[PDB]
């Protein structure tokens, strides 16, 4: 069935971040379908991507964290 990631992204993590950054918007679950990470892992890496400020959280909810890249405008 689905691929449990095991938080295994290392060299691949940088390209995983590259695709996520390219996408106009990202949701915690959208990553899990597009790349088979656990949605829990998706929160992990997304927290780092927002820490840089690549993405801007439109809204935070206990289940849904809506992020649109504040960047990518350039």
């Amino acid at each position: 069935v689905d691929y449990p990631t095991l938080f295994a992204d290392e060299a691949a993590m940088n390209e995983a971040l590259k695709f996520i950054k390219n996408s106009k918007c990202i949701t915690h679950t959208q990553i899990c379908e597009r790349l088979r990470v656990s949605v829990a892992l998706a929160k992990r890496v997304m927290r780092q991507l927002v820490k840089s400020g690549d993405f801007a959280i439109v809204s935070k909810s206990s289940r849904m964290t809506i992020f649109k890249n504040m960047t990518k405008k350039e």
Binding site: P4, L6, F7
Partner: protein, 129 residues
Amino acid sequence: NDYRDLLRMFNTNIQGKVVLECALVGIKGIGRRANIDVHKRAGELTAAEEDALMKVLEDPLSHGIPAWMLNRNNDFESGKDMHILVNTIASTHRADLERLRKTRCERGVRHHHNLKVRGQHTKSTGRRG
């Protein structure tokens, strides 16, 4: 991110991806009657921490685990509470059924005839037996 794959404790297969609390949730099925971070994930768990846990599970009354939180609480052989998992649960359940078989008891006959013991309506809800 550091990742390790399957681990084996007491001859069980452990999924590295799941959180440590879920990873141990069943040991040999009959296992989950600590010093490690329970959220780290089975892959993240170190050999050393597992060794400390191995001591904790083998001797629960040595690291602040209580008597009540034990799987067995008064025994029938030593009179003392203990934590037994893997084959020992199977050997003690056999031993407990054998003790119930030994003497004639309602507990003994029902466990053999496969009737629920201590249960009530055998009339309408034991079907498919």
